[PDB]
Structure 1
Amino acid sequence: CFTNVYADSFVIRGDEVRQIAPGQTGKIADYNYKLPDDFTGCVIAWNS
């Protein structure tokens, strides 16, 4: 059970989907959408 579900959503080229991981550095994880080194969460993704 969780105190809340927050879901973050966007669309990105596949070269950058890897940046959707905890503490990731680099352009999209640094200035677009960002996960901490402790991200107590998940990423769900497909080619669209």
Structure 2
Amino acid sequence: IRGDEVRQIAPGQTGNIADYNYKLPDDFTGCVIAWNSNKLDSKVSGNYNY
């Protein structure tokens, strides 16, 4: 997911991707780990697979 909408995916947080794809429940005991992977995910002239 693009870095603007990484913060959207959270329990009790509303958004476009956060609401229209999957919510996180309010009793979520768990972890979220992120990494900015520009080496593989970013492609020349756009990555249109996703």
**What TM-score, normalized to structure 2?**
0.59
**2:12 matches 1:18:** no
Unaligned runs of 5+ in 1: 1-11
**What TM-score, normalized to structure 1?**
0.61
CA contact (8 A) 1:21 1:35 kept: yes
Question: Which structure is richer in relative contact order (CA contacts within 8 A, separation 6 or more)?
Answer: 1
RMSD: 1.3
Percent of aligned positions with the same letter in both sequences? 97
CA distance in 2, matches of 1:37, 1:25: 13
CA distance in 2, matches of 1:46, 1:36: 23
Unaligned runs of 5+ in 2: 38-50
Return the index of the structure with the highest Cα Rg.
2
**2:28 matches 1:36:** no
